[PDB]
Structure 1
Amino acid sequence: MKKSIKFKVKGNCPITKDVINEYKEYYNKCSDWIKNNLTSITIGEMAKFLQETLGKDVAYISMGLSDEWKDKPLYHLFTKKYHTNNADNLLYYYIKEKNLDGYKGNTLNIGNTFFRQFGYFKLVVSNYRTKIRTLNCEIKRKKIDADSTSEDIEMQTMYEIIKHNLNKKTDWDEFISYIENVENPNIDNINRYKLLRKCFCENENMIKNKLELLSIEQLKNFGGCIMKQHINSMTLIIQHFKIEEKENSLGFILNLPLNKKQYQIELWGNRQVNKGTKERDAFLNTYGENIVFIINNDELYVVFSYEYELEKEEANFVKTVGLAVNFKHAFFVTSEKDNCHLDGYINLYKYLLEHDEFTNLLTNDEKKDYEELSKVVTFCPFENQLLFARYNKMSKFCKKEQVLSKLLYALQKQLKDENRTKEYIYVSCVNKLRAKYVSYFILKEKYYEKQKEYDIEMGFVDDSTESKESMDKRRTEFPFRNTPVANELLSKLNNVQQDINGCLKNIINYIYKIFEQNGYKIVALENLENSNFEKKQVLPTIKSLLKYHKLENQNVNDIKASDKVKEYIENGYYELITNENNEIVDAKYTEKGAMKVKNANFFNLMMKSLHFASVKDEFVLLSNNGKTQIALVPSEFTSQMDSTDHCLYMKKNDKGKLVKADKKEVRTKQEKHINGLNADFNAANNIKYIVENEVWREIFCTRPKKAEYNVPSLDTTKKGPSAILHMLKKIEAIKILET
């Protein structure tokens, strides 16, 4: 259906930076008003004032005084239930007849409806509507006890809904069922959910009104929708503009009518819209009405929107592959075995094993691990532990990161000289991804250090001498984000992340094209989500070590907080400085501990930065035009089931219910499953079987209706975790775990 193209202007064009600046100022004032009145103002007062001023009884004005929306907050004009155009007209005429946007014409005297009613106000309404319909609040996990106020209980009651989607009584009951039926885990967490159920269904509607009220309050604090100073775009609706191909050129001409005057904007051609292609015909035959103007690095751009027909193919089920996405060791392990059958595939773990400068520093365990990986089809030999040796000068794993990097870069030069460009781009983007992640870490932790300096220089100290009422205001009135220094770091981070995204797309394109050019009609990923990531446990901070753990006053001989804290004291993580009482009053972060926290952060930050949960979206996008199709498998039990015999190990408690075992009851310390296989090779094989096997393909893979943009050919079922457990049990996917 819809689709965009962007063009650049060549030379003469009346859309200067001042025009976009004026449009941006109008947008920002209007959206600032809407932000400041998202909830305080009532729709009823607006409609009554329109009754006072105009007096008409049109549909939108009548809907303002209807009993459904008479006293609801203004933000309901942006929800799903409220009629769209009625809200548009009501809000528009309210702002207009009060001159709250401050409109005083424009530079080029564009039509008032095309610049104000259908322009920046249209964008403001569209953007606020988009956000409020997908409100995403964020709350912390405060410890829940019997002694707590209703709000303290409720805040965590709303928290669990946010993190796990427990809107319904069914959603809670299917959740308690799951936890109690694996390993018989800690009773304390189950007690929490039981208490919340005693407090969730008690006040369901109140909780539902909350997490909307709170979500909006978390929207008027993050700035709402105020266009960021680096963007500088401008969207307009124009009625009779035409676009024609430039004469004797691979360009286009825009015939924009402005101020009743027929202008002419010269453009450059896009290779997207190159001559003779179907995309050029579709663009020129059916291009929309909305035009966007952007200033991107001191240059102007035009965005149009045309409509096309996608011809996405359908699932074939002849040659399938599962891709496990595990960031530890290789980024992309498949279900395939590296029998040198894939065309245009370079196995980098095999390349690292032929050389001896590498396998002379590797212990007997590491040799077996690397040689097990080298037998399978892997991709992007990211080594999170080795890569951290670049940042850690005193690392035990240094001289391994130097040899690894040198050998990889030497292979890159060899690939350049032998002219294998497909693999050359892959390896160069691998090297640059590894270096750019270190750059991202450097810049993002300079961001955090600078933020801490800013907090302790603006009086945002946790030790505060001001009212908490003022602190929240200033945290919003002058946050770190708006400061000039942060925009420098955020710009550098945007450049680095742009390189990261590009190199990641090059690697993903490489994998997809290898799978497509060999004949793999389906690629089965998993419905991975930010909950499927195992984050390394960061050490307790300075604040938490003394205050929560009550270490602020106790002797070294006195260890009552926890045993794990005592283990942290055993290693040189904290430097506990004794006071005159020989009990720890001042605490430190030791350089060993400082570099431990850095290792934890270095591993954890790979989730969002390297798109842990978006390595399926790019694969789907590559299938919108390719021949390989993408199948999403439920992100559970795939990395917990024996690949040789497809069964979930389960143990019989003496109570008498066959229940699954611990996630570590099946994994040893090494990345080897109890079936004697690499964990990722196990997980990848399981993924494929849930597609290869037709019965399992119908049980968990719910086929969408037809081919659609941005949609996999096969999707996971909507059944919850406990439903998936029982259905496998109902088909005898069961193995007794002989402990």
Structure 2
Amino acid sequence: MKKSIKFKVKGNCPITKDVINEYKEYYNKCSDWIKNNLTSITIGEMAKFLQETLGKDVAYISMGLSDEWKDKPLYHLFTKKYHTNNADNLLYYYIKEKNLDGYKGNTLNIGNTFFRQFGYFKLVVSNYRTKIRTLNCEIKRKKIDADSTSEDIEMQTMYEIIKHNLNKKTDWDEFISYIENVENPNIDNINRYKLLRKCFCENENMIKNKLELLSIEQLKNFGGCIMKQHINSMTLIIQHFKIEEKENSLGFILNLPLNKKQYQIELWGNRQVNKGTKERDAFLNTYGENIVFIINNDELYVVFSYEYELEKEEANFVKTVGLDVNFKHAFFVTSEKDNCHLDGYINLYKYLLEHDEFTNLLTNDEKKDYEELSKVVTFCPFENQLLFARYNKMSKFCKKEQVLSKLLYALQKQLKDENRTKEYIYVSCVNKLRAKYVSYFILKEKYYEKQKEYDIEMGFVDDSTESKESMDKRRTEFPFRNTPVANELLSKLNNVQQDINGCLKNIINYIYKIFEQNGYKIVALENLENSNFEKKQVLPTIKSLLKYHKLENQNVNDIKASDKVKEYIENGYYELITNENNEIVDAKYTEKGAMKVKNANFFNLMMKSLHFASVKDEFVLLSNNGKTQIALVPSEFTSQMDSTDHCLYMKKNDKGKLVKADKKEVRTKQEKHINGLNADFNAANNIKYIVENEVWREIFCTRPKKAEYNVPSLDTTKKGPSAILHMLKKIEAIKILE
């Protein structure tokens, strides 16, 4: 397979930001024409024009006037059945004969072949291929009543196939049995899905054809592929260029055709391609025609590609370990009791408990929970509530955060003194990660505050909704992103997130090398794909407490609102500024309510900024060269199933039916599972079981294929609670709860 190496240009280069901007504008004009004619023009018309004017007996004109494509619209060139080069040539020479992109050359006089046809136009065509070949549909949900039109119900069945992935009839049968068979079902939700399931069977193929028709019909409203204003990149493909080792140096030289002559661009050396290594030999003998110019941080970089041989190892199944990912007490918990057998490993929870100062702050049960976690093999102590004590100064966890931080930094300095580099790097990165997330949160909140200030200041008066044109033009003419305030905040946020990513990579590398050193052949992980959880608790804001809640002119003495609104009013969250007649004119977030809003934002943003569903990607990248491999398992009911029986907990019903027990019934406390273990130790030991048992490995995990770059040795196709729950029942992996 082909890899990449970046190089930094050492001197001055003709490639400036203006050249790249001109390239980008040419991209935009070409894509604008393509989007304006994606269905209006036919392939046969373009081919006929070329044959009549230029008059060539070439294959790209013969295939365009063939009967397969003579009548079809322009977007069929981007489908995977049409010949790639033939479609490129037909489109390019039609646009060129017509001058449809307004091309008048370029500033550096770069060879028009290497700049226009095989540069921006080639990227445009390759982008429009991705759009067409993965064409989707956009349907807005709607509640269907008992007496509703056929068109409304027909659309909603297509909607449910799009979102919930209901292809086969078994997909519907599992989904209904997942929704139905649970304590306290929602009758309204089941009625809609049953109606749509009935409709799906009667028009199943018509649904699959109307989906395609609607996708093609929506392509008219497509805005086209647009090269963003923040790109600062340019790709040229040149068949004949040269890369030579610079004599008496560790650098390289790029000989490039620039305005009918040869230009030389000097490149800094790269430790990925060193003089005595085999990677320099592979790079220098197998590089490709791809050349990238990118301006990152006001500096020019050059990218290339080259071939390489991958010797990634196969799975072994001799010693496996699971791993759950959490946020409340530990970042990573394995499925292995710590018994002073792993080498290079240090227990930070078994370090915290050795100090009397920390345990004295612990209540009797909390102390037992920490002593519970300290026997497992854990990593990177993250404390969601203790960390928020840094921002919320009037908190109840403040003294615990101070002691935790002090002990952690003392351990860091001690490890630095004793020359234990891997452990020292790990501890320092844990400290820095905890510190940097708070900075990220502060910067995000400031961004929100400044945006609100700017919007209220502008005072956008718009005539009507439902259309952008009716609204004030200033709302599009002067958006908040343009002002200088927004740019500094985003720069600071990007820097903080970069630090976070680096620290996380260091921690994961530590974990992987610990597992690799002792002879663990496979590491199993959850298949995490979403981390954008909804903000499940947002207090009714000032606008929403007076408009949607209709509390604007009600009575404080007699509040005609919801029970939850009564709960909120009873506590001091709000400041109702009533008038002389006890009519509310304004409402203000008090200190308690504002702090609650900040807390909700803090925990919601923690899921994303720490890249919850991307640590398996780091483990895969480390598994590309290492001896330990990676297995991805479905992340359903792993923190809801017994690790000592490998069974689910299902209770009876009022009708005597076995249904699914609530997730909060097998989980009394968030740290304990009813089986008498730690839930993270339970969840990680569930994860290991799929790999451990040959039966479950074949049932849930895909067959081991050839080793590939960024590919787990074991992966999963099934995605969804209904899919996993259905398979769990069929193998009798179920026990009856009390």
Q: Taking structure 2 as the reference length, what is the TM-score of the superposition?
A: 0.89
Residue deviations 1:385-429, cap 9 Å, x none?
A: 111122212222223223322322232222222222212221222
Q: Secondary structure at the match of 1:87?
A: helix
CA contact (8 A) 2:5 2:304 kept: yes
Q: Deviation of residue 532 (structure 1)?
A: 9.5
What does residue 353 of structure 2 align with?
353
Query: In 1, distance between residues paired with 2:283 and 2:596?
Result: 55
CA contact (8 A) 1:174 1:720 kept: no
1:80–1:586 Cα change, 3 Å: farther
Q: Deviation of residue 303 (structure 1)?
A: 0.4
CA contact (8 A) 2:538 2:600 kept: yes
Residue deviations 1:173-216, cap 9 Å, x none?
A: 33112221233532233233234446666787897789889999
Query: In 2, distance between residues paired with 1:205 and 1:63?
Result: 31
CA contact (8 A) 1:386 1:397 kept: yes
Q: Which moved more, 1:650-659 or 1:206-215?
A: 206-215
Residue deviations 1:291-325, cap 9 Å, x none?
A: 11122223221100111111111111111111101
Query: In 1, distance between residues paired with 2:257 and 2:457?
Result: 53
Q: Deviation of residue 243 (structure 1)?
A: 1.3
Q: Deviation of residue 329 (structure 1)?
A: 2.0
Query: In 2, distance between residues paired with 1:577 and 1:729?
Result: 57
Q: Which moved more, 1:52-61 or 1:357-366?
A: 52-61
Q: Which moved more, 1:187-196 or 1:31-40?
A: 31-40
Query: In 2, distance between residues paired with 1:637 and 1:488?
Result: 43
Query: In 2, distance between residues paired with 1:219 and 1:390?
Result: 50
1:42–1:10 Cα change, 3 Å: same
Query: In 2, distance between residues paired with 1:211 and 1:398?
Result: 56
CA contact (8 A) 2:78 2:128 kept: yes
What does residue 200 of structure 2 align with?
200
Q: Which moved more, 1:716-725 or 1:627-636?
A: 716-725
Q: Deviation of residue 478 (structure 1)?
A: 5.3
1:150–1:578 Cα change, 3 Å: farther
Residue deviations 1:310-350, cap 9 Å, x none?
A: 11111111111111011222111111112222222222222
Residue deviations 1:204-237, cap 9 Å, x none?
A: 7897789889999999999864444443121111
Query: In 1, distance between residues paired with 2:592 and 2:216?
Result: 43
Q: Which moved more, 1:160-169 or 1:283-292?
A: 160-169
Q: Which moved more, 1:181-190 or 1:468-477?
A: 468-477
CA contact (8 A) 1:320 1:692 kept: yes
Q: Secondary structure at the match of 2:136?
A: coil
Q: Deviation of residue 615 (structure 1)?
A: 1.1
Query: In 2, distance between residues paired with 1:78 and 1:455?
Result: 42
CA contact (8 A) 1:253 1:264 kept: yes
1:152–1:558 Cα change, 3 Å: farther
Q: Deviation of residue 526 (structure 1)?
A: 0.8
Query: In 1, distance between residues paired with 2:45 and 2:565?
Result: 58
Q: Deviation of residue 23 (structure 1)?
A: 2.4
Q: Which moved more, 1:501-510 or 1:77-86?
A: 77-86
Q: Deviation of residue 69 (structure 1)?
A: 6.8
CA contact (8 A) 1:314 1:707 kept: yes
CA contact (8 A) 2:718 2:724 kept: no
Q: Secondary structure at the match of 2:398?
A: coil
1:576–1:328 Cα change, 3 Å: same
1:720–1:110 Cα change, 3 Å: same
Q: Which moved more, 1:466-475 or 1:387-396?
A: 466-475
Query: In 2, distance between residues paired with 1:212 and 1:449?
Result: 44
Q: Which moved more, 1:637-646 or 1:510-519?
A: 637-646
Q: Deviation of residue 643 (structure 1)?
A: 1.0
Query: In 2, distance between residues paired with 1:611 and 1:547?
Result: 36
Q: Secondary structure at the match of 1:76?
A: helix
Query: In 2, distance between residues paired with 1:64 and 1:230?
Result: 37
Q: Deviation of residue 441 (structure 1)?
A: 1.3
1:387–1:185 Cα change, 3 Å: same
Q: Which moved more, 1:136-145 or 1:288-297?
A: 136-145
Q: Secondary structure at the match of 1:271?
A: coil
Q: Which moved more, 1:261-270 or 1:134-143?
A: 134-143
Q: Deviation of residue 524 (structure 1)?
A: 0.4
Q: Which moved more, 1:215-224 or 1:169-178?
A: 215-224
Q: Which moved more, 1:552-561 or 1:663-672?
A: 552-561
Query: In 2, distance between residues paired with 1:5 and 1:687?
Result: 36
CA contact (8 A) 1:333 1:377 kept: yes
CA contact (8 A) 1:579 1:586 kept: no
Query: In 2, distance between residues paired with 1:684 and 1:380?
Result: 16
Query: In 1, distance between residues paired with 2:57 and 2:366?
Result: 78
Q: Deviation of residue 38 (structure 1)?
A: 5.9
1:707–1:249 Cα change, 3 Å: same
Query: In 2, distance between residues paired with 1:561 and 1:36?
Result: 52
CA contact (8 A) 2:532 2:608 kept: no
Q: Deviation of residue 501 (structure 1)?
A: 1.1
CA contact (8 A) 2:464 2:470 kept: no
1:256–1:56 Cα change, 3 Å: closer
1:208–1:186 Cα change, 3 Å: same
Query: In 1, distance between residues paired with 2:526 and 2:164?
Result: 18
1:28–1:453 Cα change, 3 Å: farther
What does residue 634 of structure 1 align with?
634
Q: Secondary structure at the match of 1:273?
A: coil
Q: Secondary structure at the match of 2:710?
A: coil
For this pair of structures, how many residues does the alignment match? Answer: 738
Q: Taking structure 1 as the reference length, what is the TM-score of the superposition?
A: 0.89
Q: Which moved more, 1:480-489 or 1:69-78?
A: 69-78
Query: In 1, distance between residues paired with 2:82 and 2:559?
Result: 59
Q: Secondary structure at the match of 1:305?
A: strand
CA contact (8 A) 2:463 2:471 kept: no
1:7–1:593 Cα change, 3 Å: same
Residue deviations 1:220-259, cap 9 Å, x none?
A: 9998644444431211111111212121222212222333
Q: Secondary structure at the match of 1:592?
A: helix
Q: Secondary structure at the match of 1:291?
A: strand
1:237–1:542 Cα change, 3 Å: same
Q: Deviation of residue 608 (structure 1)?
A: 2.5
Q: Deviation of residue 556 (structure 1)?
A: 4.5
Query: In 2, distance between residues paired with 1:219 and 1:440?
Result: 39
Query: In 1, distance between residues paired with 2:299 and 2:53?
Result: 44
Q: Deviation of residue 457 (structure 1)?
A: 4.4
CA contact (8 A) 2:115 2:236 kept: yes
Query: In 1, distance between residues paired with 2:543 and 2:20?
Result: 47
CA contact (8 A) 2:509 2:622 kept: yes
Residue deviations 1:457-487, cap 9 Å, x none?
A: 4555899689654349876665444554333
CA contact (8 A) 1:231 1:296 kept: no
CA contact (8 A) 2:531 2:608 kept: no
Q: Which moved more, 1:584-593 or 1:266-275?
A: 584-593
CA contact (8 A) 2:174 2:726 kept: no
Q: Which moved more, 1:100-109 or 1:163-172?
A: 163-172
Q: Secondary structure at the match of 1:470?
A: coil
Q: Secondary structure at the match of 1:536?
A: coil
Cα-Cα RMSD? 3.7
CA contact (8 A) 1:536 1:603 kept: no
What does residue 252 of structure 1 align with?
252
Q: Secondary structure at the match of 2:672?
A: coil
Q: Which moved more, 1:57-66 or 1:88-97?
A: 57-66
1:460–1:68 Cα change, 3 Å: farther
1:342–1:482 Cα change, 3 Å: farther
Query: In 1, distance between residues paired with 2:500 and 2:707?
Result: 30
What does residue 376 of structure 1 align with?
376
1:453–1:12 Cα change, 3 Å: closer
Query: In 2, distance between residues paired with 1:275 and 1:414?
Result: 38
Query: In 2, distance between residues paired with 1:542 and 1:696?
Result: 52
Residue deviations 1:417-453, cap 9 Å, x none?
A: 2222212221222122112211221222223333334
Residue deviations 1:504-533, cap 9 Å, x none?
A: 111111111111111111100011221796
1:332–1:719 Cα change, 3 Å: closer
Query: In 1, distance between residues paired with 2:514 and 2:263?
Result: 49
1:442–1:418 Cα change, 3 Å: same
Residue deviations 1:29-69, cap 9 Å, x none?
A: 33455466667777677667657755768665676678887
Q: Secondary structure at the match of 1:631?
A: strand
Q: Deviation of residue 631 (structure 1)?
A: 0.6
1:533–1:522 Cα change, 3 Å: farther
Q: Which moved more, 1:253-262 or 1:329-338?
A: 253-262
Residue deviations 1:547-597, cap 9 Å, x none?
A: 444444544466665433332333333334445664656444333222212
Q: Which moved more, 1:460-469 or 1:102-111?
A: 460-469
1:66–1:448 Cα change, 3 Å: farther
Q: Identical aligned pairs, as a percentage?
A: 100
Q: Which moved more, 1:189-198 or 1:69-78?
A: 69-78
